[PDB]
Amino acid sequence: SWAQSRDEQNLLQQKRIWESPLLLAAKDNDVQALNKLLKYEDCKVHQRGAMGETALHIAALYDNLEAAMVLMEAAPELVFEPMTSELYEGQTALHIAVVNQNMNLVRALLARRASVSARATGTAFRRSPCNLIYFGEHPLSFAACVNSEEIVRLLIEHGADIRAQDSLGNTVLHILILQPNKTFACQMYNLLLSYDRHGDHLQPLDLVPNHQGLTPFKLAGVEGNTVMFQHLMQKRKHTQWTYGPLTSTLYDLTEIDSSGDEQSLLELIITTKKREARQILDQTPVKELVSLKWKRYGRPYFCMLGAIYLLYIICFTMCCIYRPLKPRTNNRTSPRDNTLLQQKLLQEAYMTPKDDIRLVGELVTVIGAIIILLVEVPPFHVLIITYAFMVLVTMVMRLISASGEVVPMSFALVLGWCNVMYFARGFQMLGPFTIMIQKMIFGDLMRFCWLMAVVILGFASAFYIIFQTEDPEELGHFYDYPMALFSTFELFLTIIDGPANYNVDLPFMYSITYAAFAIIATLLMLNLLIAMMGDTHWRVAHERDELWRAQIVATTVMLERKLPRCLWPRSGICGREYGLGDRWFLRVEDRQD
Amino acid sequence: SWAQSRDEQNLLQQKRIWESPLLLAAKDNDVQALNKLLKYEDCKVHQRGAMGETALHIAALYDNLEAAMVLMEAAPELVFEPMTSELYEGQTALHIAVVNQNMNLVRALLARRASVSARATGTAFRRSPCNLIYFGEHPLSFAACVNSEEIVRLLIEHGADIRAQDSLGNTVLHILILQPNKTFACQMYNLLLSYDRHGDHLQPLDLVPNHQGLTPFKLAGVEGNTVMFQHLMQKRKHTQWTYGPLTSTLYDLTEIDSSGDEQSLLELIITTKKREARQILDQTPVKELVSLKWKRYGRPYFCMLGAIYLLYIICFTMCCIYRPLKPRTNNRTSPRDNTLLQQKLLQEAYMTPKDDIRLVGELVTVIGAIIILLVEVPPFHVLIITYAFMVLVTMVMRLISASGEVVPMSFALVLGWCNVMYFARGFQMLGPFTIMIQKMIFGDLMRFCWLMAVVILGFASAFYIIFQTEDPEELGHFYDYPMALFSTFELFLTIIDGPANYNVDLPFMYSITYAAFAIIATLLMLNLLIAMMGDTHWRVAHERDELWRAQIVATTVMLERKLPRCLWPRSGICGREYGLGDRWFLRVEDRQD
Numbered sequence A, B: 001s002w003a004q005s006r007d008e009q010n011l012l013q014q015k016r017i018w019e020s021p022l023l024l025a026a027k028d029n030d031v032q033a034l035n036k037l038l039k040y041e042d043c044k045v046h047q048r049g050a051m052g053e054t055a056l057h058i059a060a061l062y063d064n065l066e067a068a069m070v071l072m073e074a075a076p077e078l079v080f081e082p083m084t085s086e087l088y089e090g091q092t093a094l095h096i097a098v099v100n101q102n103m104n105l106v107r108a109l110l111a112r113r114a115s116v117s118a119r120a121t122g123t124a125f126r127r128s129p130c131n132l133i134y135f136g137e138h139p140l141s142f143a144a145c146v147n148s149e150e151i152v153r154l155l156i157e158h159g160a161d162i163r164a165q166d167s168l169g170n171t172v173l174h175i176l177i178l179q180p181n182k183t184f185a186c187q188m189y190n191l192l193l194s195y196d197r198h199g200d201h202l203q204p205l206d207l208v209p210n211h212q213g214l215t216p217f218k219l220a221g222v223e224g225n226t227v228m229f230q231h232l233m234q235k236r237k238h239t240q241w242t243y244g245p246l247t248s249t250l251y252d253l254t255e256i257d258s259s260g261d262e263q264s265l266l267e268l269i270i271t272t273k274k275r276e277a278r279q280i281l282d283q284t285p286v287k288e289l290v291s292l293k294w295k296r297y298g299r300p301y302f303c304m305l306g307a308i309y310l311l312y313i314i315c316f317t318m319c320c321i322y323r324p325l326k327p328r329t330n331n332r333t334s335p336r337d338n339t340l341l342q343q344k345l346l347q348e349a350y351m352t353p354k355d356d357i358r359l360v361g362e363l364v365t366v367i368g369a370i371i372i373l374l375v376e377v378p379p380f381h382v383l384i385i386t387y388a389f390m391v392l393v394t395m396v397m398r399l400i401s402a403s404g405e406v407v408p409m410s411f412a413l414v415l416g417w418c419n420v421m422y423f424a425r426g427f428q429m430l431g432p433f434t435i436m437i438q439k440m441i442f443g444d445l446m447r448f449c450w451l452m453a454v455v456i457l458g459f460a461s462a463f464y465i466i467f468q469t470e471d472p473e474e475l476g477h478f479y480d481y482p483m484a485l486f487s488t489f490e491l492f493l494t495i496i497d498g499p500a501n502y503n504v505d506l507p508f509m510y511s512i513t514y515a516a517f518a519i520i521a522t523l524l525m526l527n528l529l530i531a532m533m534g535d536t537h538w539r540v541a542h543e544r545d546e547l548w549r550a551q552i553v554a555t556t557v558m559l560e561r562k563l564p565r566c567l568w569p570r571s572g573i574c575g576r577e578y579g580l581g582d583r584w585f586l587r588v589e590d591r592q593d
Helices: A003-019 A021-027 A031-040 A055-061 A065-074 A093-099 A105-111 A139-145 A149-156 A172-177 A183-196 A216-223 A226-236 A265-271 A275-282 A284-295 A299-321 A354-375 A381-399 A406-426 A433-445 A449-466 A481-492 A508-542 A544-560 B003-019 B021-027 B031-040 B055-061 B065-074 B093-099 B105-111 B139-145 B149-156 B172-177 B183-196 B216-223 B226-236 B265-271 B275-282 B284-295 B299-321 B354-375 B381-399 B406-426 B433-445 B449-466 B481-492 B508-542 B544-560
Strands: A246-251 A586-589 B246-251 B586-589
Touching (some): A021 A065, A055 A065, A065 A105, A093 A105, A093 A139, A149 A183, A216 A226, A216 A265, A265 A275, A406 A544, A433 A544, A449 A508, B021 B055, B216 B275, B265 B275, B284 B544, B406 B433
Antiparallel strands (some): A246 A586, B246 B586
């Protein structure tokens, strides 16, 4: 109940102006009421609303230019009056008359010398999901957003700095990018670059970052405004000769490419949670870049590392299928027909020099897992890191030489095999299946296991209690409750044969209850989940190529953060050899229509 | 053969006018035949048709203004003549000339002072599925429905009460809402409110209910006429300031919200069988209301009650998995290899103070089920109520301490687990799956079990008779017919392994018959039902969000009928603090295009 208090600071506003006949006279443009109310009797000009309202802010608010013209003579200084607090801080009526598309009161307030650099630093202006909008601080940004061109030009004519920033360090161009209207603000980007005229030696205003280092180009890459991004790419390209339908162009590639820890554009496209920024991957300077960076120097390094990983796993399992494992020379099977096991896993028998090869490849696994961890001292990181935890757990478990060492070999074995599926993404037409695993587990099954838990607890708890009476020597599916859940689980997935003896009678309730489980769960809840996975598969299969491209990009970015130079040059042509400067361009050709 | 008699009262009409040359002369506009037939010789004016027809009603019916003008001099009083019976009662020709879009005979009949308050209270006018239309009683309503504007205005000019009601208490506005044409009648709603002029102190005609308490606004909510409903919502809203694209509006929320037993709009939206009224849930004053009523004060109470229910079920099963259960110290197994069971469920052994905890939690279950019933002294009510019947059945079954107590624990156990699925609806992306259960069982399986019954009786009856010859010591699937149905059922759902021995020979017919069952039923009838469920899943998954919203609304309405105040305030802002009266409004904002 947070913004309710906001409304409590709003409706009080709707009370106060309602009970102030000055400001109720500022509601409606009753000039005669302003003359008798204002020019005749003495009235203070300092009547403050719920959060800083003046009657000049009210007539400014409710479209009353004629009332504000009466308010000029009674208030030369409420032109300079901001709003007090907690929603609107530093906002004056200049911002207000700017906002409502015009008033021509901009002529009146700049005629009374309004502060063009007034920062509306209130709560409701700041970037928030609770706020429905984000216009910045300065009214130049406000008129910039609402597409009031001659008003903006009039604001440059009154010396408003285009280079002014907000609390977030954003320039007015950064504010233009954050607007959801895209081509409706692109012409403002065309206009304000003409007002770069006094070229600052720091930047010509197009390379100015925010507090988090976002140049507006890279901001447009982060925000995924493709319409904006293409138009800024019109600036970046430098076309060469055209040959009929052929056209040689030369993209700039400075902020796009990785540089000397520039934290490149592509990195911020991957690391953002914004889904639609990956449409920037569909751009032809982008897609060609990652295409070239994959088809050479990315793909053979990836497949070579994956082959080395294959030799690591085969090197692992081979020294893992051979284990010391004496005969059970120790104690006899004390529970009858229960402890069927005979191996007990030898203590320090490091003899039999076949086991020396086991020792060598075992040390290969230990050292390789140490290499994995030294990579990872700073969704598939967790498989390899926790896998390496399991390798060290079974390693120390062998050095202490304790008993229960089958479980870390088990965990590390299923993780060690399944972790090679990360390498399937560099093998196009097998790439997006890992994403299909991701959505079928985390997107569907994790929000469906909470439903199946009901049923498995139901019939597990049923069949245990029904078979509390029975001899577990016949149909030992449910002799114990924690394994009754297990048998019930396997019956749910249609794995077990289905318990039936035919030699003795069943309990009579079991025939009903097993039919009930047979209907509601075997065909019914199961095939629904199958249909969910089927919708998932077609849904991913629709856009699997772009998703594969995202796999390639994330693979490349992850590769560059873990690989030095001298074998990875930065791609694209170099400058400086052809008079092109330090910028590393790239050329590409395209036949037309 | 009911309305056939209607036609028997219709075709007789087509006989009588055919055999009356007065009224056959009223069929066609033969003025000369009316002059020689009427003005020359003496003829009675009281010739009644099949259900009250006059020749003035016939010339009124078959578009004969010129004949009716001859009928004015011969009949000054058949202007006042109603129709007799059984279809048309109290209908006069004023209603008729109103109905056929004009005649200008409205000028003639009101020139002869026609009764504007004449109630056409016949059978065919009353609201019925057998009737194709519903126009009310008064001809003002009739001209209102057929969109004859100046005719309607002319009827107000002749003092016709707009506040008149039908047999059902419906005002003419209520009749306007019930018409299937929606925007074609909305302008009549615009027009007749201008004729509210003599403002009655009871209501200004817009709040007048019918006999079942339906204000026309709430009628439009019940009937789901969204086009009407939005237009009546135009009246209800009271917008505050606009800020560029921002717009603060303030919906009224009086008849929408629950009040002091007003029986609110949303209740009647849920309780109606009309499917399309739930589109009223899609309205932005509605959807925001139920959204706010859920996101605060609905959802934590729901999840808290569901967690308490989880502790009730876990508290149940825990004292249900532990049962007294002596060894079978009584009688020996008298049938050989049949009565495999050894527990027999102790009588009054309430010792062993672990069983005191069983007694305590057992009393927790008993008292909680009593609480469930005291809730329910006045599709998921039945699960919890009959569940609580099963808890009391096993409770008294333990107090009498009889034998067959495994079955009420079984029923109450599967119902007690499955009943928590009602609580999954307040967990979005898991909500509509319960509806998927509802449609896959009640909408598909219940109309498919009648088909599978054929096959299971077929091959069950087959395999029993084929194995009448065999030793049931081998393949005891079908030693008895009521379990032959059971084995046949499990073979249908592909659960049993499929009986095959390979040590002895099978009967030769069984190889044919089991192949026949294997084709027609294992793959064939099964996968068809799987496809039905697949269409059901996609079909529900298309509109699952609106269906989830319906779950939230029904959850809220069901919650308010079972929960007092002092912890549930009525939502929305209160009036009376800001000069807004007693009506509890709500504000909401929307950025434009």
